[PDB]
């Protein structure tokens, strides 16, 4: 147990694509999306 | 304040002041003013006809 150290140091090595790379990685875990019945409101 | 013979005026540059709003034509109690307008060659809003019947005008 200690309190002199800072543990949130991972964000020091994030690139510009970290968020979208994480989204791509998470794409495999999601449930199928619901469908409105059309391709677009303009269809 | 004396009211006598009508005249159309200009800006100091020599451009006519009238912009053909037709407010004078609408307010004239004697219907003595007749106005026709159109866009000028430069796009300015200017009259093509401005007539005052001085025998209808009540001054």
């Amino acid at each position: 147990f200690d309190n002199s150290t800072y543990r949130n140091l991972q964000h020091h090595e994030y690139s510009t694509y970290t968020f979208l790379d994480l989204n791509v990685e998470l794409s495999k875990f999601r449930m199928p999306q619901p469908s409105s019945g059309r391709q677009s409101p303009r269809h | 304040r004396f009211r006598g013979e009508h005249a159309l005026r200009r800006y100091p540059s020599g451009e006519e002041r009238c912009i053909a709003c037709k407010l004078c034509e609408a307010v004239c109690p004697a219907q003595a003013i007749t106005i026709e307008a159109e866009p000028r060659a430069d796009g300015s809003r200017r009259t093509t006809r401005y007539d005052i019947d001085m025998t209808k005008c009540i001054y």
Binding site: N8, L22, E25, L26, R30, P34 | -
Partner: protein
């Protein structure tokens, strides 16, 4: 002894956000070591009605600033299915100047937010949670994504989340620099790929929300405390603060204080005790205090004579004509140009107005020009009253509450510091003949 009369000294065991300062591992293992994701399967198996009742008896009110009772708002979505999917939208825009609590929650205790999303979605019957985070919080958003990835890997969220047979997804959506997107309907429009312009109510999001489906919009702080309220009891939550002002609150003390900081405190703590104990006091001593904006820029300011005994809850601050808001205390000492500070706030609102409706789009820019002239003293005293009326024409007549929140600081400045305005006006008058 029951019916406490003094509030404002709670020990570490009753603090919900135990990793507020990022001194412990924000990851999954560290969060589990702190009691996160504990008996979540049992809480889900209790049922939406049990969770809604536990939220109701906790006395929790909306931590976004309006202070709406959370139980009724979340039970508005307890309707049966009508063919449309049900969604939870977590507001993480964090646009109020002076407010930094949601950023700290997201970057330091993200699993609390994820578990709160799961529990609230189960209570409302939501299929998935959309977390709308500020676009400037890129590191916070990526930390939240890492936490969500760990929860998915763990089996905590997603298909058969925990082991209750309930499927729940958590998505993260980033905005692009718009404070108006903190408004719930403007946020919903922003998710749908439009301009961040608020909708009119009715319909409420509980009927027509995101993608035209039933939706509930909740603050990150409100969502985060939900699992702790469910576990520790809810009646434990109501034991803090006054009646209808229950629980614990995160305060952001900024401005003219020795130690500006984000702290957690009992709800009904007096403002002076909060400033002295945690923030280190006003710069130059308490006698140097001039004004305090108690709940972010949208709340009217109060002078030193009111800050002596005022309580830091919704009802007490309403009685002081300022409201609690986001519990962001901006402190200004006697060495500040208070007119300039209020003008800066008005300029912020001018730059953040979405321009959809006439009263905000026009009157806020008008008040901005008027306050710019006031700062230099380039007006006459009668205009002060004029300014007041201008604000009264904006308040209550706009679509969203941004017009109200732009009018309120002007009203507070006129109410408490009119002689300063008149003195500046006369100084400019005889200085320029």
């Amino acid at each position: 002894a029951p019916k406490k009369t003094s509030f404002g000294s709670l020990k570490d065991e009753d603090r919900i956000f135990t990793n507020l300062y990022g001194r412990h591992d924000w990851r999954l293992k560290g969060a589990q070591s702190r009691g996160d994701w504990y008996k979540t399967k049992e809480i889900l198996l209790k049922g939406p009605d049990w969770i809604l009742g536990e939220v109701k008896t906790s006395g929790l009110r909306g931590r976004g600033g309006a202070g709406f009772p959370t139980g009724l708002k979340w039970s508005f979505m307890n309707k049966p299915s009508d063919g449309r999917p049900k969604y939870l939208v977590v507001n993480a825009d964090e646009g109020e100047p002076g407010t930094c609590k949601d950023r700290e929650i997201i970057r330091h205790d993200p699993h609390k937010l994820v578990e709160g999303c799961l529990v609230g979605g189960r209570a409302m019957g939501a299929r998935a949670a959309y977390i709308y985070i500020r676009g400037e919080f890129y590191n916070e958003a990526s930390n939240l994504q890492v936490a969500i990835r760990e929860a998915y890997e763990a089996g905590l969220i997603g298909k058969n989340a925990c082991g209750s047979g309930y499927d729940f997804d958590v998505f993260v959506v980033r905005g692009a620099g718009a404070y108006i997107c903190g408004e719930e309907t403007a946020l919903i429009e922003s998710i749908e790929g439009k301009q961040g312009k608020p909708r009119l109510k009715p319909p409420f999001p509980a009927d027509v929300g995101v993608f035209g489906c039933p939706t509930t919009v909740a603050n990150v702080e409100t969502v985060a405390v939900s699992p702790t309220i469910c576990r520790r009891g809810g009646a434990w939550f109501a034991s803090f603060g006054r009646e209808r002002n229950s629980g614990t609150k995160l305060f952001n003390i900024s401005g003219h204080v020795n130690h500006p900081c984000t702290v957690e405190e009992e709800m009904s703590v007096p403002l002076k005790e909060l400033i002295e104990k945690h923030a280190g006091g006003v710069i130059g001593g308490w006698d140097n205090l001039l004004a305090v904006i108690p709940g972010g820029s949208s709340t009217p300011l109060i002078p030193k004579s009111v800050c002596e005994t005022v309580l830091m809850d919704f009802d007490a601050l309403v009685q002081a004509q300022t409201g609690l808001g986001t519990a962001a205390v901006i402190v200004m000492d006697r060495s500040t140009d208070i007119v300039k500070a209020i003008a800066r706030l008005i300029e912020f609102y001018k730059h953040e107005s979405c321009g959809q409706c006439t009263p905000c789009r026009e009157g806020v820019d008008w008040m901005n020009k008027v306050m710019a002239r006031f700062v230099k003293g380039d007006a006459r005293p009668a205009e002060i009253d004029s300014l007041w009326e201008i604000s009264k024409q904006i308040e209550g007549h706009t679509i969203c509450a941004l017009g109200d929140g732009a009018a309120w600081p002007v009203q507070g400045l006129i109410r408490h510091f009119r002689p300063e305005l008149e003195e500046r006006m006369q100084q400019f008058a005889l200085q320029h003949q």
